[PDB]
Amino acid sequence: RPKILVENEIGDENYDWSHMLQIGRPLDGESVIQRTMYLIKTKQYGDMVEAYDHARYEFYALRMQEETEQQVALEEAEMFGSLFGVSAIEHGIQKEQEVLDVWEKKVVEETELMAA
Amino acid sequence: FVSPLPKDYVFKYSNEKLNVIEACFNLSKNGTIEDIMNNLRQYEGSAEGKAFAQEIKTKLLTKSPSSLQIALRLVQENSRDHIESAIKRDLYTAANMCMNQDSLVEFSEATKHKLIDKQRVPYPWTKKEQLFVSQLTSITSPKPSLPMSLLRNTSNVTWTQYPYHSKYQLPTEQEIAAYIEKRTNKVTEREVLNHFANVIPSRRGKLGIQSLCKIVCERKCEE
């Protein structure tokens, strides 16, 4: 999952780690960890490990929800006559194809070299 | 070495509270604590501001009346007069409090109750009436019975107002008002802020100066 490291105003943010989903921040392992730390501070889970587990479990549900959202959005798009010119897998195949073509010509030359 | 204030910072004294303070605590030549209390009682305006005024009246009541009166008597005189004389006056009144001949400033007992004995609970007080002006003067003035004198400085100098404070702090409402008057003889808020935050060389990088100026504008002037 790509990570942007270019900071927006660090002073402007104000995250209540009662929950994971903050607004300016995305959902990631960081958010989990922040939640764990919050739990530790508040002493809901006195143990660190338990708090971590809890945060992980909170994350998982959110991730599952995110996954379902995208798939159903795609389904909807398919239903209502949306048209996607290049799918991700198709793109990948195309990318592979050029490389393979490059390899083939080179490989033939190498075989010829070897023969002679 | 300064730093800006946090983004959650709010100036404690709101506009309406400042206005009610201005209404109540401003007094004439012969103002009193009783007069202030009356003013607080009869103030009318915002509900929150009224509640605040009531609260401050209550806390005045809780505190001692004679000491408050003495303070009131002192402050106008000190505003009028110069530093050294004011200091001397303060010293004299402290002496009088220590050695109360007239027995009209229950101080030592109150201190014992508070500082020595116990932190909790206010003192009940055993003296509550309007002291006369001559009596007040006598309380805050010297006599030939006891000799009094401040210890001599190297710089034995006397002045009516501070030589170096006005430059190196946030500018008073009065100064802002004077500037506005000068400008008049159009004017706008942004221009005023620029003048205060940029033109004045001593107060270019003052921390919460623009905000202060804005507050002042909100309080006093109009469009």
């Binding site: 030359e109 010829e112 070299l113 023969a115 002679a116 | -």
Partner: protein, 87 residues
């Protein structure tokens, strides 16, 4: 593993950067022909097209077709890539 740090040198450079080109087509054809002639007697028609191809290649000149900036990078980046302590 055992790292090997050099001392401070005057100039990091390779004395002969190889720009490993591909071998010549005409030479290859000639070698193939030679290989064919090792078998099949002196000049049988199994290598009838190969000889023709060789001739076509070596018509204008004996060889058909006629540098790596590597020590332009070493020279450039030596001062960076050093672990030379500060001044």
């Amino acid at each position: 593993p055992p790292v090997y740090r050099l001392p401070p040198l005057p100039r990091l450079k390779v004395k002969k950067p190889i720009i490993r080109q591909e071998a010549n087509k005409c030479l290859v054809l000639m070698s193939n022909l030679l290989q064919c002639w090792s078998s099949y007697g002196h000049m049988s028609p199994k290598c009838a097209g190969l000889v023709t191809e060789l001739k076509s290649c070596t018509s204008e000149s004996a060889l058909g077709k006629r540098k790596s900036n590597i020590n332009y990078h070493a020279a450039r980046l030596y001062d960076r890539i050093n672990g030379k302590p500060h001044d």
